[PDB]
Ligand binder design. Sequence first.
Ligand SMILES: [K+]
Lengths: 660, 660
Amino acid sequence: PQNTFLENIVRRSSESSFLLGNAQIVDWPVVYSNDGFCKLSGYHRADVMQKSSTCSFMYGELTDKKTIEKVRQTFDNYESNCFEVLLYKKNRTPVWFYMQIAPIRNEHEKVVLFLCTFKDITLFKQPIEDDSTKGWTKFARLTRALTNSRSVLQQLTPMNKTEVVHKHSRLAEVLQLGSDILPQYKQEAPKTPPHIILHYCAFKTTWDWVILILTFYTAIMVPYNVSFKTKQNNIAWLVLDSVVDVIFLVDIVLNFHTTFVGPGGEVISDPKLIRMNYLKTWFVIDLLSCLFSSLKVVRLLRLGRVARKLDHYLEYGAAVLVLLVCVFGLVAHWLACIWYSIGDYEVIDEVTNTIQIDSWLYQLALSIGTPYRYNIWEGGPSKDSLYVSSLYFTMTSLTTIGFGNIAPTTDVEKMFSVAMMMVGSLLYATIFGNVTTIFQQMYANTNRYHEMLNNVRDFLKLYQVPKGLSERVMDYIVSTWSMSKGIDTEKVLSICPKDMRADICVHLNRKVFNEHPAFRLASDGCLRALAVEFQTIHCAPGDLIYHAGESVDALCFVVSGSLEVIQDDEVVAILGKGDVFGDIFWKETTLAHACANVRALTYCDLHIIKREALLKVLDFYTAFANSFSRNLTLTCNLRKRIIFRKISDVKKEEEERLRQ
Amino acid sequence: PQNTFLENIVRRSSESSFLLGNAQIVDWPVVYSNDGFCKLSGYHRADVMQKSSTCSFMYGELTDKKTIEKVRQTFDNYESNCFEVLLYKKNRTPVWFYMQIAPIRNEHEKVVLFLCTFKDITLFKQPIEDDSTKGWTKFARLTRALTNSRSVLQQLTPMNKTEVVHKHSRLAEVLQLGSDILPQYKQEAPKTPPHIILHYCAFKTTWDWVILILTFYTAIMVPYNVSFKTKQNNIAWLVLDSVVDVIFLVDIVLNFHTTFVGPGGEVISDPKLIRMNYLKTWFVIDLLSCLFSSLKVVRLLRLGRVARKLDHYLEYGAAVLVLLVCVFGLVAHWLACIWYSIGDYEVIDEVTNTIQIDSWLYQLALSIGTPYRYNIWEGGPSKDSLYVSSLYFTMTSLTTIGFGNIAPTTDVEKMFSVAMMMVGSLLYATIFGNVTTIFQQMYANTNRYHEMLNNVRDFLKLYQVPKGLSERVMDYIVSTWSMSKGIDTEKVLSICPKDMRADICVHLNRKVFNEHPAFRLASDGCLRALAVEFQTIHCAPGDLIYHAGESVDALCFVVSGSLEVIQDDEVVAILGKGDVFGDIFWKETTLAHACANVRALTYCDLHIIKREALLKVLDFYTAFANSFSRNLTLTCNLRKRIIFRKISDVKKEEEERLRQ
Ligand SMILES: [K+]
């Protein structure tokens, strides 16, 4: 979905000086100045911007008061007009301009912008100039200002007193241009000319699959009809052929109304280019449809016509395996048809009207019971037994089995099998290369995990790591691969741009930015700065986050599980399910000593933000920092040491006092 | 092993205000306040914490002295009671609360915690209020305080003078709740409901393997009985079938008492979910057990029943190869049974009672001696020769050998072999993809080492490195791969969390932290900080650690071998087996010049800690640094240069003096 608005204006204006300006703002500041307005006015695109769209920066002591109010009036209430005025220039040269103010709406009509296409007219207006010494210089400036008016604009009828053909010609031009040049400032979609079908539509996919099915049917059925010569008695076998031919003719017709992707861009819906491409490329498919062995062998090119599109149906994976099976079947069928075609030409030699003994059909008849008999020679084996036996031989010859009960033996079967054994070998090699590559690609995901497990196990066994640590490490590896099965967050987030990465990071930490009072008065430009530095750890029971001597270096937000803050082998706090613990990193300026052991009691989920990153973010948005300091209350500050006395010490002191 | 204690309390309390507090500490500080206690008291979970668990932070001038002593009494000696008191609130609103103090023990009874579940009761107590202007406001507050009491708590019998049904109803409620809500504060284990069997237990694995063996037996034996039709004469072949059927029925019964792992978690021992899952999933296996070709072909689904669990038995490696062999055998057996089933229906045509000559059993009888004879047609070949010959043909057809002495030739054997040659090709392709992938994974470990050796050899040969250096480099590579065969410490330590990495690093350097006086008064939080930065080098004889001009930058502890400190080609120290050498990095603030060559005399083992890391650790724990400086004595300080004079110089000076 593109918002092309600056492309529709320029193409449909023929080198104008349009000066788009905002409408909702007071005084209507401009937002864009075309290059044409930068040469017909002398100003650059650094002084025009943020000035009024009424073109009030080139007023003066000679502009008429009868029209200076009218432009403001027509800007007040949203309507289009074609006033003309007298404006100055950067070099203080008076010149008459022809304004064409016209409103431009939103997707829902809200008049967002104000098109202000200009047009220089000086030859057609009365020459007036105050600061001049020679009167002919004004007439010279008349021609100097209008150079294109005598070349392409108004040279149709060059003759005097022709003022009306300049005013009344384009009074309501924008009204006539309401359909030509007044686009809609909306997020558009790929537009299609009339009677044009997109190639991403939900209709072309179904038609493509139907064409695939019908091409597979034709590939199966054409050689069988050509070689075995089934007599056309049933009506169905003819109406089906007629329907298929009509459908593929309709497909050829529809190929003239499809949009091919540009070589260096995206979809191009231009009929001329589409027709040129299809004329240049694919009459190989036009030959087959228009109208017997030769005709049907020509029709077989329809398989190539459906295979030219072998990217909308397929992928690289199991689909390639299915295609490899389907092409092996078709090759085994085509070779079975050619083998019977060869083996029927040699059975009966018409020169002597005698049967050839060293053929393959005669030996079939000699090893199946039914022989050939002479009336001409009458029938022999059936026709449902000459296809099974002809496919069986080619299956023995393509799978490299070769039982050898049906063998090539005359003169030509031996030199046809030499050609068959080459195509069979080539197909077998390609199949057994593709299968290996596909299987390696498929199982490359589950080999890294086992390799890592073996590496870790060998490491833990070589260095004689104790049983407890080895069990904990193996359990951690298995658990972390059981919920993150091959997915690495860093690799996926690295290939995304700076905008989508921040949004994904904000989405991941949605259980800390939503259910926490601290992250309430935070701008969208600050959440996308905090979320990038948030980490996450998946603790296990018994795991220690902070030991009794480590330095607290990061805030941690618990979103699942429970924690236990043990100090002097005494529980002083039980955090869990939305409790923040750590140190006040902003108002200390010093690292602290973790004065208690934080041990996990359940499989936890902590979101960690480091001290340096938190200070870097908080030292830049020095407005959210106040709210963060005034709204974040740590339930367990691991810098202040709590002082207490167990009851055992009290009892011992009481006993000591009782002693003396 | 999870320590779930905050989950058992909340579920079994029905939205209470439990206020767990410590017991061993004096005054019983609290350690956790439920959200309920944060709305029935107005306090947040930042002021309640570290206050007394007797709820002494909401006392006042109206609480009764007859019960304020009783709560302290029952807290002194560990016992449970259900006192009720009058307490204030954060907004100074008097309200009556119903305390339910109850002790909570450890794994070994030590009364760790004190559950202090509260309950608001105001409607049922005498309305008393001091700071009020209107008397009806107190009655309004009676209803305002108790909103859930008229909805779910005590709306069973709404009627007046019903005070007893509020007091005596739950006097000893915690005594009745001693089994409902009073968990044990211990590191628990996955608990199982009665009559529920875990799937990790040592019993389910043996039963699974038994099911695997019996399914393999059934897969072997069912087609043989169906096709070859062995007459059931022996008692064993029937009692074995009955026993197998009974065992698999018992397996179906036990499948109702197994725990399947949750889709987004771990084991779930809930009978309702287990039954719902098994009802939804697997009556395909219930059909086969309950009660002839069709029945046994249905029974063959038991193989799918045992293959659905193809992750508890298998792995990715040689086990896949064993499975591939075992499935090839079973396919060759099933095809051998189907081939004999086809080849027995065609031998004798019952329409004419004549033998078909172009079958495969008749040609077997014609090429094995024993023919078929007519009495009906009597027996021919034996029954132990019709299975060997039927498996031989399928082995020729699946291994793509095809001797062709037994061949498909009638009408149906040719169209059954066409279907056999497709499944054979598919199985062969999958097998030869899996074998290649498995072999690549297996031998990928020993290809990196040879590739590195070849790279190093080509590097040393291209640049014409001298013989000595090349030999030393190759020996070093071979030696370092002979004791670290593929294991990289950094990769294994990088995939571990911050807690296990420190423990592993401490374990690795156990020969320096134990047998050294310097690392004696070191806290557990300091050894885990030093051990991460310790390195290790495996020297070789003749290798120099510090040359005569290098800068000493790290402390080195020798744990194996011997070293030689040569200065001016004179030995001044022989370090070995627990001797530290280097420079005093803390009390110098300046880099030094190594004034002697430290050469290895034997295959050594040095543990190296750099200067910057050592200073960073020692500048943070400024209590261990004093002990480290007062307990570490270097036996060879490579900053102080020793001054001496060889005897040769003395002799030369004496000779010079004797000269004149
Ligand atoms: K062969």
